[PDB]
Scaffold this active site. Structure first.
Site, PDB file in Angstrom:
ATOM      1  N   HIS A 198      -3.587   6.002   3.991  1.00 37.22           N
ATOM      2  CA  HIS A 198      -4.362   4.845   3.556  1.00 37.22           C
ATOM      3  C   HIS A 198      -3.743   3.532   4.037  1.00 37.22           C
ATOM      4  CE1 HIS A 198      -5.719   1.915   0.425  1.00 37.22           C
ATOM      5  NE2 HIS A 198      -6.849   2.596   0.474  1.00 37.22           N
ATOM      6  N   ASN A 232     -14.309  -0.075  -6.200  1.00 42.64           N
ATOM      7  CA  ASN A 232     -15.266   0.880  -5.646  1.00 42.64           C
ATOM      8  C   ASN A 232     -16.076   1.584  -6.723  1.00 42.64           C
ATOM      9  OD1 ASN A 232     -14.067   0.396  -3.003  1.00 42.64           O
ATOM     10  ND2 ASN A 232     -12.367   1.591  -3.840  1.00 42.64           N
ATOM     11  N   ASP A 255       0.837  -1.191   0.000  1.00 42.38           N
ATOM     12  CA  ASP A 255       0.000   0.000   0.000  1.00 42.38           C
ATOM     13  C   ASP A 255       0.883   1.257   0.000  1.00 42.38           C
ATOM     14  OD1 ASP A 255      -2.237   1.918   1.088  1.00 42.38           O
ATOM     15  OD2 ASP A 255      -3.248  -0.014   0.864  1.00 42.38           O
ATOM     16  N   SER A 304     -11.168  -1.084   0.143  1.00 42.35           N
ATOM     17  CA  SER A 304      -9.862  -1.057   0.790  1.00 42.35           C
ATOM     18  C   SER A 304      -9.951  -1.322   2.281  1.00 42.35           C
ATOM     19  CB  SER A 304      -9.221   0.324   0.655  1.00 42.35           C
ATOM     20  OG  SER A 304      -8.681   0.573  -0.622  1.00 42.35           O
TER      21      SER A 304
END
Ligand code: 47E
Length: 279
Positions: free
Chosen positions: A69, A161, A39, A224
């Site tokens: 994130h 998403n 990530d 996520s």
């Protein structure tokens, strides 16, 4: 063990019903397992990680998470308050820049890195990788995820998403990895969650409280956020000896809460991750 006033998603994964707020789990808590968070990085100094997090690789000028994130996702895997597997070891691999963007070639390199790097780590109970990222369909990206899984790592990937069929996204569309959709606290499919035959499981993804950079916390939403619930659950179940990296996705589907989510399109699994812990 019981964690009172837990984030709703933790309570959900140990419950046969929505609407409770205590997380119940075996005290082994993923000890002896390892989870790679591929990530934007991890703020390993966050008190919530208790020294159990470390950066092991970056493709950029720093290994620090300048975004948040990756720190949030790592917190859902394994932070003391916000995590599923509260005693796992967390390894950060920074394939995304501080704006959250990354080239597929770097992401592929990061996956192959984990497949080798696990041989440099002590993970007697098993190894998991959490990939809260993706983009358009790429056979090379899917193949990299398949290699990582084949090497003996439980790979969990976000479905995406776009409120669309995940077959058009990677690594979401790779059949051999665990593709994770998102749900909300009322057991509805999250409004943004991708769907389709390639999904294996849903996890909590709307309004998820976890760690953030600057030693902070915040609530955000996405597939996520659902993915690290499943990654942490896999690590927890592997430490318990109930499953292995090769079989954990199927085991999680076998043992999921079934038929409880609303707005699941015809042809998408109606399965919500569940630890089946009996206190
Ligand atoms: O919805 C998106 O932003 C991308 O399509 C996508 C695809 C797969 C996984 C993620 Cl986290 C994001």
């Amino acid at each position: 063990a019981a964690q009172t006033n837990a984030p709703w998603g933790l309570a959900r994964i140990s419950s046969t019903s929505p609407g409770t707020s205590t997380y119940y789990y075996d005290e082994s808590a993923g000890q002896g397992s390892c989870v790679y968070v591929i990530d934007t990085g991890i703020e390993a100094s966050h008190p919530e990680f208790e020294g159990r997090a470390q950066m092991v690789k970056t493709y950029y000028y720093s290994s620090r998470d300048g975004n948040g994130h990756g720190t949030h996702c790592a917190g859902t895997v394994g932070s003391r308050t916000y995590g599923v597997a509260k005693k796992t070891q967390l390894f950060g691999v920074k394939v995304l820049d501080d704006n959250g963007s990354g080239q597929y070639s770097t992401i592929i390199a990061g996956m192959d890195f984990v497949a080798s790097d696990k041989n440099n780590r002590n993970c007697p109970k098993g190894v998991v990788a959490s990939l809260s990222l993706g983009g358009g369909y790429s056979s090379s990206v899917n193949s990299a995820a398949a290699r990582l899984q084949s090497s003996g790592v439980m790979v969990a990937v976000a479905a995406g998403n776009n409120n669309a069929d995940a077959r058009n996204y990677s690594p979401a569309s790779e059949p051999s990895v665990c593709t994770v959709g998102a749900s909300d606290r009322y057991d509805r499919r999250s409004s943004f969650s991708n769907y389709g035959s390639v999904l294996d499981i849903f996890g909590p993804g709307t309004d998820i409280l976890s760690t953030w950079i600057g030693g902070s916390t915040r609530s955000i939403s996405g597939t996520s956020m659902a993915t690290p619930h499943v990654a942490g659950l896999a690590a927890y179940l592997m430490t318990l000896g109930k499953t292995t990296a090769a079989s954990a996705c199927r085991y999680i589907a076998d043992t999921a809460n079934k038929g409880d989510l609303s707005n699941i399109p015809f042809g998408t699994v109606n399965l919500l991750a569940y630890n089946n812990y009996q206190a």
